[PDB]
Symmetry: C2
Subunit: 231 residues, 2 copies
């Protein structure tokens, strides 16, 4: 049950932006007293790591070599360090992050000052399985796109209703107090064509993933919750 | 050659394939120099790239007597497959089947040309993470961003229309029909209500048919922009 709980918690968690040394990553970490589950990406490859208590203790002793703490305390400290950075950027949490690409694995090194005290951790994230990356990125993104298309359709029909109201008002025999407020009739085809011609290049620019985690997280979380509830 | 095939595959839309009580999303690009195929089931993605030598050898192995040049075989395969992918429910005899190997997928297509059998097999191996990413993740994120921008623009237009309606009302001239009254538009309330009721049905990915039927043009535009 511990593994299932960790997987569910990771799935429910939203994406966050990590500013490594001269690089950027999209990270999604769920940490509980029994271990943690991390999923990192850079829009080109996705690495995953599910880690339990025994390996946590082994790695902590190997790295720190002088810190004697139980796995639960280590997990709690790691979660406390990581949460402020994921929640918001530019947080002076004193968490230096480094990335190493050796073989197909990824070494994510985190250094912190635990009350002015070195604290080192290393995520050995192997390549994510096709099923995990699929259910975490592809299906949720398709659901988000479908939901946004439905929202666009609802807005278009509401705009058509408002246009009909404006036409009825004009037919009633009334004139606007001003003239700048006049709005030309809304056409779905013309609006879509103009958008595609003009604003599509700017909107489509994902860049380093910051827009995705800035404007497409509430919808992503809702879609993921719906998917997990369904099955 | 290889670059041309990769670009063609990247610049093509997903098509729905129905076969043996199963559904797939397929992107196929054929050319005289070979073909590229990408098949997904929303759980795994398989990619295949075949050149003239491989296509000729496989055609000889399968069709024991279809003595044709590789270019002609590829052209016939394209002419037989593209009509189905472009539009579903086509009057063709292209029967499809899948065999799920431990790691590979055998996609067998059997059809009839001029009333004679025509067999072909795609031995699609699991697509590399880079290919799957570039083909699905980044374009999907671009589509989401574009749709969000469209929603924002529509909300701005709705706000302008609300301002116009308010200005009309302040003049004191009421409507002739009272059934056309629409309440003022509010982004927060509309978004909350939509998420409450229509989100479960809107976000129902299903077997992939709605994705192909709804927003393939946006996917193509996003992919073309990404290529440039």
């Amino acid at each position: 049950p511990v593994m299932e709980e960790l997987e569910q918690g990771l799935l429910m968690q939203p994406w966050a932006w990590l500013q490594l040394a001269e690089n950027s990553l999209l990270a999604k970490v769920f940490i509980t007293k029994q271990g943690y589950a991390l999923l990192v990406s850079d829009l080109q490859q996705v690495w995953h790591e599910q880690v339990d208590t025994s390996v946590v203790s082994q790695r902590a002793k190997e790295l720190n070599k002088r810190l004697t703490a139980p796995p639960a305390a280590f997990l709690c400290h790691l979660d406390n360090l990581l949460r402020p950075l994921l929640k918001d950027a530019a947080h002076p949490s004193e968490a230096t992050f480094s990335c190493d690409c050796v073989a197909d694995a990824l070494i994510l090194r985190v250094r912190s000052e635990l009350s002015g005290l070195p604290f080192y951790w290393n995520f050995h994230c192997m390549l994510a399985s096709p099923s995990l990356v699929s259910q975490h990125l592809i299906r949720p993104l398709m659901g988000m796109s479908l939901a946004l298309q439905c929202q666009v359709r609802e807005l278009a029909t509401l705009l058509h209703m408002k246009d009909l109201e404006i036409q009825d008002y004009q037919e009633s025999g009334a004139t606007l107090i001003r003239d700048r407020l006049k709005t030309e009739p809304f056409e779905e085809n013309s609006f879509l064509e103009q958008f595609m011609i003009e604003k599509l290049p700017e909107a489509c620019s994902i860049g380093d993933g910051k827009p995705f985690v800035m404007n497409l997280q509430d919808l992503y979380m809702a879609v993921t919750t719906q998917e997990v509830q369904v099955g």
